Amino acid sequence: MIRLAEAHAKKNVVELEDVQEAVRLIRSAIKDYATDPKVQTGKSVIQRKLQEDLSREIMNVLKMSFNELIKQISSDIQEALSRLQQEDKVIVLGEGVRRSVR
Amino acid sequence: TLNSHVITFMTRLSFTAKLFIYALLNLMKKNGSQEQELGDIVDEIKLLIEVNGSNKFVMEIAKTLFQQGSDNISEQLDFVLNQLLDAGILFKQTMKNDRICCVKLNISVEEAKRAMNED
Amino acid sequence: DPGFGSLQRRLLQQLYGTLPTDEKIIFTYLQDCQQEIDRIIKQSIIQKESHSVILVGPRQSYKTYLLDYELSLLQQSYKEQFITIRLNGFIHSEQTAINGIATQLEQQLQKIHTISSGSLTEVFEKILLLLDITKITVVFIFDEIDTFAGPVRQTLLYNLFDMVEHSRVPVCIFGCTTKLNILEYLEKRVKSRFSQRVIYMPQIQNLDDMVDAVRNLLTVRSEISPWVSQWNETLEKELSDPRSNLNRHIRMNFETFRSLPTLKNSIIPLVATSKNFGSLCTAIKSCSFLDIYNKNQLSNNLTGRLQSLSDLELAILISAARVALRAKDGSFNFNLAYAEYEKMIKAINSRTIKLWLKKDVKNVWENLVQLDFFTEKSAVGLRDNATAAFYASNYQFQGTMIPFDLRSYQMQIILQELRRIIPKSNMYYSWTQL
Amino acid sequence: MNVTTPEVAFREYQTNCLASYISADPDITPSNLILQGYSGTGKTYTLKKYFNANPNLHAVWLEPVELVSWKPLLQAIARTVQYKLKTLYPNIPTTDYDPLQVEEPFLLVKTLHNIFVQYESLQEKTCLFLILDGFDSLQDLDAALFNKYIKLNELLPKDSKINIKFIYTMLETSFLQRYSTHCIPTVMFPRYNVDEVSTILVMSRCGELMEDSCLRKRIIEEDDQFQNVAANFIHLIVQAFHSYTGNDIFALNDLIDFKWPKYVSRITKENIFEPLALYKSAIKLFLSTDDNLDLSIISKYLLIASYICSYLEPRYDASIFSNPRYLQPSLFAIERLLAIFQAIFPIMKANIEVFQNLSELHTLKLIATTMNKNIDYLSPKVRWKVNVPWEIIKEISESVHFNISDYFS
Ligand SMILES: Nc1ncnc2c1ncn2[C@@H]1O[C@H](COP(=O)(O)OP(=O)(O)OP(=O)(O)O)[C@@H](O)[C@H]1O
Ligand SMILES: Nc1ncnc2c1ncn2[C@@H]1O[C@H](COP(=O)(O)OP(=O)(O)OP(=O)(O)O)[C@@H](O)[C@H]1O
Ligand SMILES: [Mg+2]
Ligand SMILES: [Mg+2]
């Protein structure tokens, strides 16, 4: 991982973005296995738990920008916002800030 | 009368009962023996939790399923097990051990996967 | 305080369900289920119509509670038009079910205004001559009907269903079972006489269904205490706010248990332990007693039993786990566990732990077996019914003749799970990786 | 809820849980109450003190461990209920029923219904607690036995002045998890640690150790001073046997009585005020547990040949006479045993003396077979195997000067 992160920036220093890219290359081959070698919406929740997690911070504000939601709580973040928009739960109001339902 | 209430029964269960069915079906697609022990289901449930442990969205459920939101409660390793046995869905042999006890499915396998995808 | 004593007793009577019929608590999700049951009861006692419906639902799904409320509602107006005949599947067997019907008939007929006399053959003969201005509805309450639906013969199930179609006496059979596929458990002729009326009990779907049920179980709708108006404001404040402690325990039980009688086991001791009104509002807001009840329920399992062990009890279980892990079938005895424990003491002291002799580990080995840790290899254990329990006691197993140092045992917890429930401060953590 | 909560040592949560369920009003009292807890947790101590301070509650004690089978259990319930209700209200003329007529689970409902009908002359509802101390300790135990007792209150009439109350005290954990779907308020009992075990034994054994006959006879031959002496011996016993006993109360109480007379006689006129010299004088009472408190020549050689035939294959026997000991021994034949026994015997045909020692070897349970009761020695299908450990067979071969360790090396 040291030579992989150093060759990505070859930049005179090693930034945090170069180290994160080296871990993805190592995890691409050593994963999906543990004690034995050899879908995620209902069985592995994630989508069911994120609907109550991201909306919890929005409801607490009314009692926000797209960059503030990440710092307070990013492919799954934008996917959860599009699900609530179809059910009339949130308001887009542009890409800058977000507005909750009245 | 011609309807089947087994499909709609698993869709209204809790997360602990739905996780036990999803863990049993995943073990059948790896070995293909129709006889998974009780020790393999426990190891498969913990394996799915530690998939994305570094993310804050998945660790919110680990504190409840293993500590119930309490620091004094230690990390745990029975309610959802005996519930499916009396409903005629899950089977369990007469064994005094809780690791090598085989678990078999009484209902069909095609109708069991439709309830997991509906959640 | 006389004001707090009247409110504490009223709040406890609502959770147990001992309220009278004129003040019963009906949930929102169960309102559409009791209406169908009330229609069958009102049609067999008033209209005198024979019916047959077998209820199907999970354990503690408000099955007997809904049937007891329907019998109490009809007894407050039509108490001389029907009788109560209750039956069980676990208590009453095949031969005892015949005498149970005749026994409950002689005691109910003398109360409105013999049958159970003789041998077993003469008792069943008088029942068929009775069941098979108005009549009297014979309400049959059958509990655990899956035990009587044996694939060998269903004699009682065939005679009970015959008292509905062919017989003119109105007989209302309300079976209560837990099997979802109760139609396949019947015979070809038993299912023919049934009306195929299977009413499935509803379950908790969304989260708002559990909040309305808890609110209806802790709200005093009667003027019996001066603290009633103050208690309703505190309960409504904590329930309407999702950031409170009461809404957190409900959401946690909704995704883990999703059962109303299960969650009611912690609200009852929370109110009874309060000394005054100030202690009741404090425990209902912070929920400090709820965290203590959850720790006690998981204190005698496989995790809580490891913390109550000494240094020798932990070294034996660790050394015995490494033998079954490195083996093929996981078989080990006292001789294999003592070899790993002896090699661990000499390895740690070489880098003073008192090494116990072989005559002292026998007491520690027998103490771990009673604590549910070492199970016998290929052992059944507790039998299902009483038939297999008698045949197993008369047969001498092979594990009782062999000595204790040659008995094949099995580990109830693998070495992978022991490394997670052991902190890094213990000295036995280095021998749990292998 | 009007009841008195006693003060139990290290049982503050367990005593408060019993007062929230057990009450004098059946409207706020559950029909089932399980008291799960292993041995040495204080289940009986927290229940006797709770019922002794409150004399308004009527509880019936029953020990299912003294009835073996489940048939006498149904007879002891109706016998103890009628006997308790007789002395409770002697001004009521009731009819005595035969408790031996309860042989079926259905007969228990009819017997209990014939008793509650003659007790309707009371004013308020009086509870009837039926404590079952040790339900899982019954011999003929099955998974369908507990299902017949949790539904007994359903068959009972609701308009009765006396309602029964079942109280179970389980011991193991897997037996409780088999009925977790019934939603029963279970009160668990965790095991004590190293700080609560020694404190319990001090407040329970100091009242009998300082007033013993041995300690009173030692001070006259050689009350605050005798209290610290008895308290020091209890603390020294627990700290020296914490690993041998664990956290059991019965395992530590037996070791105290076994070492009390040996510790009193070692006390002189100088060891009464100096506890350092007293521990060194009796060093043989804490370093070990002190445990607990003629074979024939042909019989000795027969056990040696039986150990070889049960731990070695018979296919390589034509190369020696011409770890397998860690597993179960194998079965051999009678003629296969006499062949090796004749080879290892020093300078003999198979007469009746050899078969006489072999028949006596099976009486002492030194060699196992294939049948336990009614064995046939003349049957050709019944095989024989060894039944002695390696440590026992090692000392036997050493007395006859026979090398038994070289055959397995
Ligand atoms: N007569 C009654 N009075 C008060 N509460 C009652 C009564 N009957 C039942 N209940 C309550 O009903 C709740 C749910 O159990 P219920 O008996 O309704 O379900 P069940 O499915 O018939 O039972 P089980 O699963 O044990 O066979 C219990 O927690 C109990 O408190
Ligand atoms: N907290 C305590 N304080 C003082 N003494 C205690 C305490 N707990 C238990 N004891 C003592 O422990 C002794 C032995 O325990 P006991 O047999 O009563 O416990 P148990 O858990 O009910 O047993 P079992 O599992 O055999 O039914 C009792 O005589 C009692 O005096
Ligand atoms: Mg019921
Ligand atoms: Mg006891």
Residue D183 touches partner C, C-beta closer than 8 Å: yes
Contacts of D398 (CB under 8 A, 6+ apart): none
What are the helix and strand counts (H, E) for chain A?
Answer: 5, 2
**Do the beta carbons of residue C296 and residue B72 sit within 8 Å?**
no
Closest CA to C12 of C265, C252, C275: C265
Contacts of D364 (CB under 8 A, 6+ apart): none
Backbone angles phi, psi at C380, to 5 degrees: -75, -50
For residue C34, the ligand closest to its alpha carbon is 1
Give me the amino acid identity at C380.
Answer: V
Q: Is the CB of C60 under 6 A from ligand 1?
A: yes
CA neighbours within 13 Å on the CB side: how many for D46? 25
Contacts of C38 (CB under 8 A, 6+ apart): C70, C73
> Per DSSP, which regions of C270-373 are E strands?
none
**Do the beta carbons of residue C340 and residue C322 sit within 8 Å?**
yes
- How many whole angstroms separate alpha carbon C289 and alpha carbon D264? 48
- How many whole angstroms separate alpha carbon C126 and alpha carbon C137? 18
Output the residue whose Cα is nearest ligand 2's atom 7: D42
Q: How was this structure determined?
A: cryo-EM
Contacts of C405 (CB under 8 A, 6+ apart): C333, C334, C335, D389
**Do the beta carbons of residue D5 and residue D11 sit within 8 Å?**
no
Output the residue whose Cα is nearest ligand 2's atom 25: D39
Chains D and A touch (3+ CB pairs under 8 A): no
- How many whole angstroms separate alpha carbon C141 and alpha carbon C132? 18
Token readout for C388 is 């297999």
**Do the beta carbons of residue C414 and residue B99 sit within 8 Å?**
yes
**Bridge partners, residue D369, by sequence:** D384
> Per DSSP, which regions of chain A are E strands?
90-91, 99-100
Q: If you measure from the C-alpha of residue C15 to the centroid of ligand 1, how many angstroms do you get, rounded to a whole number? A: 12
Helices (H), C164-259: 208-217, 228-240, 246-256
Instruction: Tokens 């009765």: give the residue.
Output: D160
- Our CA-based measurement puts residue C145 at a distance from the nearest CA of chain B, in whole angstroms, of 12
- How many whole angstroms separate alpha carbon D393 and alpha carbon D399? 10
Query: Torsion angle, CA of D59/D62/D63/D69, rounded to 10 degrees?
Result: -150
Token readout for A33 is 């296995």
Indicate which CATH number applies to the domain containing D18. Answer: 3.40.50.300
- How many whole angstroms separate alpha carbon D136 and alpha carbon D114? 29
Chain-centroid distance, C-alpha C335: 41
- How many whole angstroms separate alpha carbon C282 and alpha carbon C89? 45
* Inter-chain CB proximity B86 and C421 less than 8 Å: no
Backbone angles phi, psi at D220, to 5 degrees: -95, -10
Pocket test for ligand 1, best of C19, C65, C199, C201 (most atoms within 8 A of CB): C65
DSSP-assigned states of every residue in C63-81: SHHHHHHHHHHHHTT-SSS
CB atoms within 10 A of CB D306: 25
Q: If you measure from the C-alpha of residue C284 to the centroid of ligand 3, how many angstroms do you get, rounded to a whole number? A: 31
Q: Is the CB of C259 under 6 A from ligand 1?
A: no
Select the residue of C255, C381, C417 nearest B14 (Cβ to Cβ).
C255
Instruction: Tokens 């005679």: give the residue.
Output: C159
Q: Is the CB of C3 under 6 A from ligand 1?
A: no
Residues of C in contact with B43 (CB under 8 A): 416
- How many whole angstroms separate alpha carbon D292 and alpha carbon D189? 30
Contacts of D335 (CB under 8 A, 6+ apart): none
**Do the beta carbons of residue D341 and residue D300 sit within 8 Å?**
no
Q: If you measure from the C-alpha of residue D136 to the centroid of ligand 4, how many angstroms do you get, rounded to a whole number? A: 12
- How many whole angstroms separate alpha carbon D194 and alpha carbon C121? 65
Select the residue of B79, B96, B98 nearest D180 (Cβ to Cβ).
B79
Instruction: Tokens 């300078």: give the residue.
Output: D347
Select the residue of B86, B96, B98 nearest D181 (Cβ to Cβ).
B86
- How many whole angstroms separate alpha carbon D214 and alpha carbon D219? 9
Between the two ends of chain D, the Cα-to-Cα distance in Å is 74
Chain-centroid distance, C-alpha D374: 31
**Bridge partners, residue D165, by sequence:** D129
Between the two ends of chain B, the Cα-to-Cα distance in Å is 25
What does R_g of chain B's alpha carbons equal in angstroms? 15
Phi-psi region of C330 (alpha: psi -120 to 50; beta: other; left: phi over 0): left
Select the residue of D1, D16, D37 nearest C9 (Cβ to Cβ).
D1
- Our CA-based measurement puts residue C277 at a distance from the nearest CA of chain A, in whole angstroms, of 30
Q: Is the CB of C64 under 6 A from ligand 1?
A: yes
Give me the amino acid identity at C356.
Answer: W
Contacts of D204 (CB under 8 A, 6+ apart): none
Pocket test for ligand 1, best of D27, D156, D160, D183 (most atoms within 8 A of CB): D183
- How many whole angstroms separate alpha carbon C64 and alpha carbon C60? 9
Output the residue whose Cα is nearest ligand 1's atom 5: C17
Contacts of A80 (CB under 8 A, 6+ apart): A47, A50, A51, A54
**Do the beta carbons of residue C193 and residue C165 sit within 8 Å?**
yes
Contacts of C319 (CB under 8 A, 6+ apart): C337, C340, C341, C344, C431
**Bridge partners, residue D163, by sequence:** D127
Q: Using CB atoms, which chains have 3+ pairs under 8 A with A?
A: B, C
Q: Is the CB of D41 under 6 A from ligand 2?
A: yes
**Do the beta carbons of residue D180 and residue B78 sit within 8 Å?**
yes
- How many whole angstroms separate alpha carbon D143 and alpha carbon B101? 16
- How many whole angstroms separate alpha carbon D92 and alpha carbon D81? 15
Q: What angle in degrees, to the nearest 10, is found between the helix axes of D105-116 and C96-112?
A: 20
* Inter-chain CB proximity C336 and D326 less than 8 Å: yes
**Do the beta carbons of residue C206 and residue C258 sit within 8 Å?**
no
DSSP C202: P
- How many whole angstroms separate alpha carbon B77 and alpha carbon C356? 31
Contacts of C214 (CB under 8 A, 6+ apart): C239, C246, C250, C263
Report the DSSP pairing between strands A90-91 and D162-168: unpaired
Q: For chain D, what is the largest distance between any 2 Cα atoms, rounded to a whole number of angstroms? A: 95
Q: Is the CB of C59 under 6 A from ligand 1?
A: yes
The burial of C231, by beta-carbon neighbours within 10 Å (0-12 exposed, 13-18 middle, 19 or more buried), is given as buried
- How many whole angstroms separate alpha carbon D385 and alpha carbon D377? 13
Q: If you measure from the C-alpha of residue D166 to the centroid of ligand 1, how many angstroms do you get, rounded to a whole number? A: 16
Specify the 3-state DSSP secondary structure of C22: helix
Closest CA to C199 of C175, C170, C220, C223: C175
Chain-centroid distance, C-alpha C10: 26
Specify the 3-state DSSP secondary structure of B92: strand
Chain-centroid distance, C-alpha B55: 23
* Inter-chain CB proximity B30 and A36 less than 8 Å: yes
Report the DSSP pairing between strands D59-62 and D126-132: parallel
- How many whole angstroms separate alpha carbon C160 and alpha carbon C169? 12
Closest CA to D286 of D246, D231, D237: D237
Cα separations (Å) of D287 from C354, D237, D241, D282?
10, 10, 9, 10
* Inter-chain CB proximity C375 and B96 less than 8 Å: yes
Q: Is the CB of C62 under 6 A from ligand 1?
A: yes
Residues of C in contact with B75 (CB under 8 A): 303, 420-421
SS3 content of chain C, % helix, strand, coil (to 5): 50, 10, 40
Which residues of D are documented as binding site for ATP? 37-44
- How many whole angstroms separate alpha carbon D241 and alpha carbon C360? 10
* Residues in chain B after which the chain is broken, C→N over 2.5 Å: 77
- How many whole angstroms separate alpha carbon D238 and alpha carbon C152? 60
Domain of D154 in residue numbering reads as: 12-188
The DSSP element (H or E) to which B21 belongs, if any, is helix B15-28
The burial of C136, by beta-carbon neighbours within 10 Å (0-12 exposed, 13-18 middle, 19 or more buried), is given as middle
Report the DSSP pairing between strands D384-386 and C374-376: unpaired
Residue D324 touches partner C, C-beta closer than 8 Å: no
- How many whole angstroms separate alpha carbon A37 and alpha carbon A25? 19
Output the residue whose Cα is nearest ligand 2's atom 19: D42
Contacts of C329 (CB under 8 A, 6+ apart): none
Residue B114 touches partner A, C-beta closer than 8 Å: no
Closest CA to D229 of D239, D219, D243: D219
Specify the 3-state DSSP secondary structure of C191: coil
- How many whole angstroms separate alpha carbon C410 and alpha carbon C407? 10
Measured in residues, chain B has a length of 119
